[PDB]
Amino acid sequence: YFRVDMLLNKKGQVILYGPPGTGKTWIARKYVVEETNEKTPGNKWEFITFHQSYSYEEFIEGFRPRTDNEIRYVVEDGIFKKIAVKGKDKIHRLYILLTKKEPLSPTEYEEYLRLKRYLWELVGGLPKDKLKNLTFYLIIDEINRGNISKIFGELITLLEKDKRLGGENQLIVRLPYSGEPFAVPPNLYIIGTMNTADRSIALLDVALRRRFAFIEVEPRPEFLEKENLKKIREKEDRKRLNEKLNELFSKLGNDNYFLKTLLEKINVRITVVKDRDHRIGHSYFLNVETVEDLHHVWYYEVLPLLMEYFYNDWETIKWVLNEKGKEHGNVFFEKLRLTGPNGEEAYQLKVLEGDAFIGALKRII
Amino acid sequence: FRVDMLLNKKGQVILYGPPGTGKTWIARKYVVEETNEKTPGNKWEFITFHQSYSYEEFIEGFRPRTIRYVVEDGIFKKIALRALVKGLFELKDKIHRLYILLTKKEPLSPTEYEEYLRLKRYLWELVGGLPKDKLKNLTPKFYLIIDEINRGNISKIFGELITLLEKDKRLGGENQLIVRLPYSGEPFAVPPNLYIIGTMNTADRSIALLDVALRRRFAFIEVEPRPEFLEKENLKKIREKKLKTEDRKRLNEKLNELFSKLGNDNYFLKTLLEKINVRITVVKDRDHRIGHSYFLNVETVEDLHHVWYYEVLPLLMEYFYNDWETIKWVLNEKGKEHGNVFFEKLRLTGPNGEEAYQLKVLEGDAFIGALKRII
Amino acid sequence: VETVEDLHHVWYYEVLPLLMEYFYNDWETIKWVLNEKGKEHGNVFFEKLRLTGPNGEEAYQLKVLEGDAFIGALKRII
Amino acid sequence: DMLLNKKGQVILYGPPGTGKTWIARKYVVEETNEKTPGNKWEFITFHQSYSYEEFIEGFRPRTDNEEKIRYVVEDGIFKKIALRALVKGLFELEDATIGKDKIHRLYILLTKKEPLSPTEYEEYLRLKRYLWELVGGLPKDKLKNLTPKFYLIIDEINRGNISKIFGELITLLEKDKRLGGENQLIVRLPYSGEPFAVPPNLYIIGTMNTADRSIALLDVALRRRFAFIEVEPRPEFLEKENLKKIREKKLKTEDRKRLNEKLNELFSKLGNDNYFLKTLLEKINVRITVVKDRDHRIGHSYFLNVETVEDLHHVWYYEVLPLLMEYFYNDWETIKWVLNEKGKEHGNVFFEKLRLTGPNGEEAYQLKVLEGDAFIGALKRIIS
Amino acid sequence: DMLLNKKGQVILYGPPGTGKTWIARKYVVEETNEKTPGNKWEFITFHQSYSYEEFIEGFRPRTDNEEKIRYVVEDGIFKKIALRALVKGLFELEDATIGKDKIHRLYILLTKKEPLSPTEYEEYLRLKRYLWELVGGLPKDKLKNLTPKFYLIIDEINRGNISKIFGELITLLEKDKRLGGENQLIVRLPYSGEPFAVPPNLYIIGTMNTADRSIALLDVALRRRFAFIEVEPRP
Amino acid sequence: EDYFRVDMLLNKKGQVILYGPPGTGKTWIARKYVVEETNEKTPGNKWEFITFHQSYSYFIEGFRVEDGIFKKIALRALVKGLFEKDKIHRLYILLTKKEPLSPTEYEEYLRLKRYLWELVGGLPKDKLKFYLIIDEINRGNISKIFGELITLLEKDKRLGGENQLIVRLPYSGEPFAVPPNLYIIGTMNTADRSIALLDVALRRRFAFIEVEPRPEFLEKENLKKIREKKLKTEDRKRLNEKLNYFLKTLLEKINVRITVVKDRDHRIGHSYFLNVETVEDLHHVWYYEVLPLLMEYFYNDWETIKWVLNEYQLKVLEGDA
Ligand SMILES: Nc1nc2c(ncn2[C@@H]2O[C@H](COP(=O)(O)OP(=O)(O)OP(O)(O)=S)[C@@H](O)[C@H]2O)c(=O)[nH]1
Ligand SMILES: Nc1nc2c(ncn2[C@@H]2O[C@H](COP(=O)(O)OP(=O)(O)OP(O)(O)=S)[C@@H](O)[C@H]2O)c(=O)[nH]1
Ligand SMILES: Nc1nc2c(ncn2[C@@H]2O[C@H](COP(=O)(O)OP(=O)(O)OP(O)(O)=S)[C@@H](O)[C@H]2O)c(=O)[nH]1
Ligand SMILES: [Mg+2]
Ligand SMILES: [Mg+2]
Ligand SMILES: [Mg+2]
């Protein structure tokens, strides 16, 4: 927890990077209750997932008139930047910001906007050190999936700790679309989740890495030791899963470290034949109760992902599975009975049930 | 059974494989009994992806009013809100007015535009306080079938569904999340009520599903070509169907006379498709095999001639375009030319040394003898 | 087509620009289609240029025909 | 002309110096009796920026004082041309006088309206008129083939994408697919939705370079619609009897005599050989044909403007010799051979060996200028 | 100079550092009596992103009552200069074309500054639409002897795709198929179909650099039109 | 060093090339030239670190903050010298606004180009500081960034010579003026041969005085003559606690190999030798920038690959014996 709680005020923000299967979305949804204690993410902690069709919606933008003929700048993320000083106007400002209904009361916008025009001089007439300290968190899931030079024009420079509210070298810039000039608070911190298996640098922006930190949180098989596994899933049915996972490993040969060493020996074979970002994460094995569901997640989730990885490359898939050239017997893929004119050799997918499926998983270790 | 377990455990199922296998058929067959309805519109919606879908027509986009523009909900947002408001019945006045606005297939009034826009303020305020042990069990079930899912830009279409479609991140899960949509500022989540089914073709690598993250959300079940169904006993059962009219029994002697002009080998079309598909797996990928649907409604020996010469031989001539030594190896006639063969070598020889064949329309008992020899 | 001029107009304006676009600057291949590969300086469609390239190149030229010399080039194809 | 009446359309192709565009324009002015574009005479030049929307039908944002004048499909140049012939040929039919003032007087004044006027009541009138034209556009197939002719010139057809700029026309421009043909076809258009067909009234003449193999007619099914008349470079034109014949017919201001004097001495200066220019071009052409493509041959248009010897010296050193250096860049020998000075490295040589060599051992040559009767001399050597 | 009166277009080839761009405008100023690139002596520098739409005609957004949805066809640099030369030349003419009310409106119009009025553009169209049928009915006798000569400089012509930037100018730039040649041609513009040709009093002077051979001019056909003069770096 | 030869040949060529390989003390001696005399320590104007990001619709184009963040220094390099008359002092009121401009008075903001059309032609040409350097120039395509830049910047084709040259741009014109005081060099280098001298015709605008990394920067009286610039908080003589031809037999023992068959302008920097102070940091000179940094560069070539040490499992030994 030491690298989790206060490795955030050093820089502006930080992105969680890793292959799929690593719960970066889950580990960003854990600090929302360990630091903000907001089980409902409506106030003081927001959650948006970026995608390739999001623009003029992380700032202020001219939207339609509130049920008229024909027209006002609607804000959608400055509402989380005007949300970070009371700890009557500002004291009630937060509800105007958290306006669940149409917040456009015939005059509610109006009260809100003027209150904004003062801020810029209420802080503009205020010194530095009183808000250098402050007693929020916005999560952008799949941050690489949106155009960072379109959702932010020239505004990701303003999230650094020096260019925020309470710094010596800190400024405010007039917002386009008739927005009072804006700046970012220092207590506003961004936790992002990124996928690196698609590309090692997916969002290839120079100003992204110079204002965000990166962490390569690895697939941890240590989370598959049966003892380790029960510590996740028990937090009337805390005991019904106990004999379920006990007889799971008992059919598996009473081995607690089975699914741990199955994953890491496969992932180290993928790391040789493919990139290191192509490792299989650990979430594919958390919802495993019986060997039937292990057989299901093997045959219907990770094997066609592996066949996608190596396509028509029977040798590579066989080697990663450790068939290692076995052409018959308990083999996931079995060589066909024909050989082509120029040396072509082919294999077919075989279904393995019973004890022949577990022992075929033993030869991959 | 493979489909109902995985659609309950993972929340999303993609059926993959070569064409001709029942991926689209088993999608309809699964939902016409779990809904007990043969027409979509209620508890059931069937769409089909292509490259002209968008996020704006799948979740929400700005559409003009016949008033400048308004945000209308896409097909997934209509059925996810329908699945949630149906599940909030048996778990009550205003949400009954909300369900009748979503099911209102006629267009909606401008007075009822902001009436519908006001009722989902109440619903998303409601589910933010209801505990995670009530929304997990909803007594109806909703199904959306996305046929040909790899023919559209899925990550652009599935805007916020990358985070939402996970089982524990649905409504009533251990990690239940509610995301604010960037259009209209409205909060949204997907219930555990709605189960999505996808169908895809593995033949086209151009449309291949290479997104690992999207792959984790769904469970992939492959419907393989099964030549076993082409056996006389099984093809008689596969043709014994909803057509239970006088032509039940009269179709079987047409099947009996057809195999009687094939040597009464009841495993002939099974061995024909099996020996062919294992040869396509060698010289090309496994995902270019012939599907069993090409040989289902064949009843006469002329009907097989229509299948063989007009569907699969022009398709095999496109796999191996101007590659005669490969296409005659699938038909086990590499060294055989100038005989009872599908392609006969032109007598002339190329100036620089080239040599090539011409397809011959083998008809009559000749046709069967060029098919047996493939076994 | 019904005249000998009409078949001369199909050959010299439609199919010979087609074959010279098929095998562009490939003279020994296109003369094999008319089986006149070793046959130069006659009633041929492509006559051999007397000039020869410095590093060994050889070129041809399209010859126009009319009358009884035309059909002998056609029976040469048969 | 014979191919134009039988195939319906002819693409003229060859090296650039041959007279392809000129023959096209001369033929059109003579047949139409119209020496100006418009009134049944159309000239266009295809380019990559050309589009199906521009040629046949596309949505055009036409802005007018009144709002919403835009957001209206605009028929393209070809469609306008097909219409303006169709219904002008519908202005005279034997005893099938259906309407006879609609097809003769509704939208000939609208389609050939030189003021591009979006008269919003009359624009709708255009549309109503077209639909009737189409139903009565099938009065009877037999009398369909009898109208007055119209013509369009597409220059540099290779430069544009014919497969895209021309769309449904690939099916239609075939002659029997036109109106009154043995297999008549009427097509449905995507944007406006109005039906469309080409008549035998409209003829299309195309111009094409084949020295550029990038813009080449690789569309083999598209070649079946057209007819290809290869105009080789006729060096026979550089002869004095023709050089005068093709250079004075239009102008009769007594400038013919001056040209006669100008070239009479010219030939006299050139060994009194009236074939000297012809030989230069022909020898050069055969030589170019061997070492490179035959379509990179020099055409006669470079040498038709020669009236004095000093005019021809500007043609060699500013048009012909810089063209040959682009054929063979740092390929000195091939240029040297085409001038029949293959190994010569001396005076009376266009390219001269540079003495130094690369550490890698490479060698180079230098172009040298030549002038006077002395320069006239090197030309004959290429012959030898 | 003599090559401009015969070929029409000259291209001053040479490597970088040669006096190619400088004498391109040194010869231009002394043959138009205009020190500044005003009516004549216009200057254009190509680049790799230069387009056909900027050169002849294209769709551009314009503000009519500050509404940006109005997209109207904008005439390019060449269209404007070619039109200006022709209109000034038509200033001297017989009775059919003697009346200069319309001619002066059009010429001043091209001569005008950047602003194009919502109410100015339509008058330009009326005059231009007239202008085609007037010169279409005018004989080819007076049209070859246009007195005021216009000139255009194209710098760095190797940078752009000249075969794409030149459109219909593959045809119209030859001297015998300008307005008043033996084979006079007039073409229809692509956007909305307006008639257009080049009068003989407009002359183009290019400037090429042979270092970038790969995207240097490769269209052999385009070469016949223009004349070529090598410029070696004479010290 | 080089601080006494450069200040005498500025009005001849305008821009001079003093080339060097990447990594060495080059990106500070560039910052040396702008801070020492004028001491302009403010951004936005005349003191901006500048390396382009190779993204260009690209003499000036690439529209939308309109065209470029620093696309108007060529006028301003003489405009402050051409201000000695509301016309004379209106340029500076808008350009000292670091804010986006309002649409309330847009027509008044772009109406000022009207008077100076023929005044700058009537301006005396000998009436004549600001520095904008291009970095990351040859990393991307230099032919894309070089439009009409090569002919305009030479010796006599400025305005201070006899050869007269104006500029031309579309979209409402706006021709500007050119001084010889302008400082736009651009880093000329060959760290990648794919783009290096792609425009081989570069003759009459530059020269080549090679700036090798100075080998005399390793002596005990010459190591940290340069290395004290950064110190501010009492660090001038903390390094007098551990000093009690030292390490010169490290550089020319390696950087004479860089020239023979090795590529010359892939040299290693001495900016990493900035603050060698303690006794623990004596591992980074033989095991970090000597042996592994020169190992995996030849094509499995032992001579290039095995030449790591001048002063399988990787062997371990510490440098005291
Ligand atoms: N308790 C716990 N559950 C985990 C952990 N990692 C994965 N999980 C399980 O799987 C999920 C992990 O988050 P996950 O969905 O894998 O991250 P993600 O960022 O969405 O993954 P992706 O979107 O980048 S493919 C959780 O919902 C939980 O069910 C972990 O470290 N702890
Ligand atoms: N009864 C029965 N019919 C089947 C079965 N598999 C396929 N069919 C029949 O095959 C035909 C086509 O099957 P279908 O599911 O539509 O292929 P597909 O999924 O579209 O394949 P594609 O999408 O890759 S082109 C239909 O007539 C269908 O009923 C099966 O298992 N049982
Ligand atoms: N009078 C006359 N002139 C001819 C003849 N052949 C060519 N010319 C002249 O040659 C020149 C070019 O001919 P033209 O037909 O315009 O070439 P083109 O097809 O346009 O050439 P391209 O470069 O675009 S591929 C013109 O001056 C033309 O008049 C001919 O037979 N008679
Ligand atoms: Mg995630
Ligand atoms: Mg299907
Ligand atoms: Mg032409």
DSSP F72-108: THHHHHHHTTT---TTTTSHHHHHT--SPPPTTSHHH
Q: Which residue has the tokens 């598909």?
A: B277
| Axis-axis angle for helices D372-383, D276-291 (nearest 10) | 50
Q: How many angstroms separate the alpha carbon of residue D17 from the centre of ligand 3?
A: 7
Nearest of B171, B188, B172 to residue B180 by alpha carbon: B188
Q: What are phi and psi of D154, to 5 degrees?
A: -105, 115
> Exposure pattern of F254-293 as b/e (b: 16+ CB <10 Å)?
bbeebeeebeebebbbbeebeeeeeeeeeeebbbebbbee
- Assess contact for F47 and F100: CB atoms under 8 A: no
Q: Which residues pair with A179 in a beta bridge?
A: A175
Residue closest by Cα to atom 7 of ligand 2: B22
| Pocket probe mutation, ligand 1, options A283, A301, A302, max atoms within 8 Å of Cβ | A283
> Exposure pattern of F34-64 as b/e (b: 16+ CB <10 Å)?
beeeeeeeeeeebbeeeebeeebebbbbeee
Give the strand pairing for B194-199 and B12-16: parallel
Residue F302 is inside which H or E element, if any?
helix F302-305
Distance CA E148, CA E160 (A): 30
- Residue A18, classed as helix, strand or coil, is strand
A332-A333-A338 Cα angle (round to 5): 155
Q: Which residues pair with A216 in a beta bridge?
A: A17
Regarding the beta carbon of D22 and ligand 3, being less than 6 Å apart is answered yes
* CA distance from start to end of chain C: 20
Nearest of F136, F265, F269 to residue F210 by alpha carbon: F265
| Axis-axis angle for helices B232-239, B250-260 (nearest 10) | 150
Tokens found for residue D261? 């004097």
Strands (E), chain A: 13-18, 45-49, 60-63, 72-75, 137-141, 173-175, 179-182, 189-195, 212-216, 333-339, 345-349
| Axis-axis angle for helices B94-102, B75-90 (nearest 10) | 150
Q: What are phi and psi of D109, to 5 degrees?
A: -70, -15
Specify the long-range contacts of residues F1-9, CB closer than 8 Å, at least 24 apart.
Answer: F1/F214, F2/F29, F2/F211, F3/F32
Residue B250 is inside which H or E element, if any?
helix B250-260
Q: Which residue has the tokens 């022909």?
A: D282
Tokens found for residue F68? 């470029």
Distances (CA, A) of A167 to A105, A133, A170, B55, F107: 36, 10, 5, 41, 37
Q: Which residue has the tokens 């080409």?
A: D198
B98's CB contacts (< 8 A; 6+ apart) are B85, B116, B119, B120, B123
Nearest of F29, F70, F18, F66 to residue F46 by alpha carbon: F70
Neighbours of A306 (CB within 10 A): 19
Within 8 A of D62 by CB-CB distance, chain E residues are: 192
- Residue B35, classed as helix, strand or coil, is coil
Strands (E), chain E: 9-13, 42-45, 57-61, 71-75, 150-155, 187-188, 195-196, 202-207, 227-230
Residue B14 is inside which H or E element, if any?
strand B12-16
Give the distance from CA A208 to its chain's centroid: 17
Neighbours of A51 (CB within 10 A): 23
Within 8 A of F143 by CB-CB distance, chain E residues are: 48, 212
Sign of the C-alpha dihedral, residues D191, D196, D202, D204?
Answer: positive
Tokens found for residue F204? 């009459």
DSSP B84-140: HHHHHHH---HHHHHHHHHS--S---HHHHHHHHHHHHHHHHHTTTS-TTTTT--SS
Sequence length of chain E is: 235
Distance CA B205, CA A125 (A): 62
What is the three-state SS of D56-76? CEEEECCCCCCCCCCCEEEEC
**Experimental structure resolution, Å:** 3.0
| Axis-axis angle for helices D255-269, D240-247 (nearest 10) | 160
Tokens found for residue C10? 């199909």
| Axis-axis angle for helices D120-135, D77-89 (nearest 10) | 60
Neighbours of A318 (CB within 10 A): 20
* CA distance from start to end of chain F: 35
Nearest of E33, E13, E8 to residue E24 by alpha carbon: E13
Q: Which residue has the tokens 């599975």?
A: A321
Q: Burial of F199 by CB count in 10 Å (0-12 exposed, 13-18 middle, 19+ buried)?
A: middle
- Nearest CA of chain E to the CA of F56: how many Å? 10
Nearest of B204, B302, B199 to residue B257 by alpha carbon: B302
Method underlying the structure: X-ray
* C48 residue type, one letter: K
Strands (E), D218-298: 228-230
Specify the long-range contacts of residues D36-40, CB closer than 8 Å, at least 24 apart.
Answer: D36/E136, D36/E137, D36/E186, D37/E136, D37/E186, D37/E187, D37/E188, D37/E195, D38/D112, D38/D114, D38/E136, D38/E195, D39/D112, D40/D84, D40/D85, D40/D88, D40/D148, D40/D149, D40/D150, D40/D151
Tokens found for residue A293? 């569901």
CA B212 to ligand 1: nearest atom: 25
Interface test with D, best of E70, E162, E213 (most D CBs within 10 A): E70
F259's CB contacts (< 8 A; 6+ apart) are none
Nearest of F192, F208, F207 to residue F266 by alpha carbon: F192
Distance CA D18, CA A49 (A): 64
- D255 interfacial to chain C (CB closer than 8 Å): no
- Nearest CA of chain C to the CA of D291: how many Å? 6
Breaks (C-N over 2.5 A) in chain F follow: 58, 64, 84, 128, 244, 311
Residues around ligand 4, an ion, CB closer than 5 A: A 25, 193
* F222 residue type, one letter: N
Q: Is E156 annotated as ligand-binding?
A: yes
Distance CA E92, CA E199 (A): 14
CA D21 to ligand 3: nearest atom: 15
Q: Do A300 and B220 touch (CB under 8 A)?
A: yes
When computed from its CA atoms, the radius of gyration of chain D, rounded to whole angstroms, is: 27
Q: Which residue has the tokens 């030079």?
A: A149
Q: What are phi and psi of E99, to 5 degrees?
A: -60, 120
Distance CA B301, CA B297 (A): 12
Q: Which residue has the tokens 């016409």?
A: B32
> Exposure pattern of B236-255 as b/e (b: 16+ CB <10 Å)?
eeebeeeeeeeeeeebbeeb
Nearest-ligand number for the alpha carbon of D295: 3
Breaks (C-N over 2.5 A) in chain A follow: 70, 84, 87, 135, 235
Distance CA D106, CA A136 (A): 72
Distance CA E90, CA E104 (A): 10
> For chain A, which chains pass the contact test of at least 3 CB pairs under 8 Å?
B, F
Tokens found for residue A349? 């997918």
- Assess contact for D43 and E185: CB atoms under 8 A: yes
Distance CA A100, CA A96 (A): 9
Distance CA F240, CA F82 (A): 52
* D370 residue type, one letter: L
Tokens found for residue B224? 């393989």
Distances (CA, A) of C20 to C41, C47, D210: 19, 14, 11
Distance CA B362, CA B372 (A): 13
- Nearest CA of chain D to the CA of C36: how many Å? 20
Q: What are phi and psi of B16, to 5 degrees?
A: -120, 165
Tokens found for residue E82? 């070619």
- Assess contact for B201 and B149: CB atoms under 8 A: no
- Assess contact for E23 and E229: CB atoms under 8 A: no
Distance CA E15, CA E24 (A): 15
Identify how many contiguous H helices and E strands chain D contains and give both numbers: 16, 11
Distance CA A122, CA D27 (A): 83
F305-F306-F310 Cα angle (round to 5): 120
Residue D204 is inside which H or E element, if any?
strand D202-209
Q: What is the DSSP letter of B310?
A: I
Regarding the beta carbon of B202 and ligand 2, being less than 6 Å apart is answered no
Distance CA E171, CA E185 (A): 8
Strands (E), B151-237: 179-180, 187-188, 194-199, 219-222
Interface test with A, best of B206, B212, B332 (most A CBs within 10 A): B212
Distance CA D165, CA D169 (A): 9
Give the distance from CA F148 to its chain's centroid: 21
Nearest of B317, E193, C53 to residue D74 by alpha carbon: E193
Distance CA C45, CA C64 (A): 7
Q: Which residues pair with D367 in a beta bridge?
A: D351
Q: What is the DSSP letter of B232?
A: H
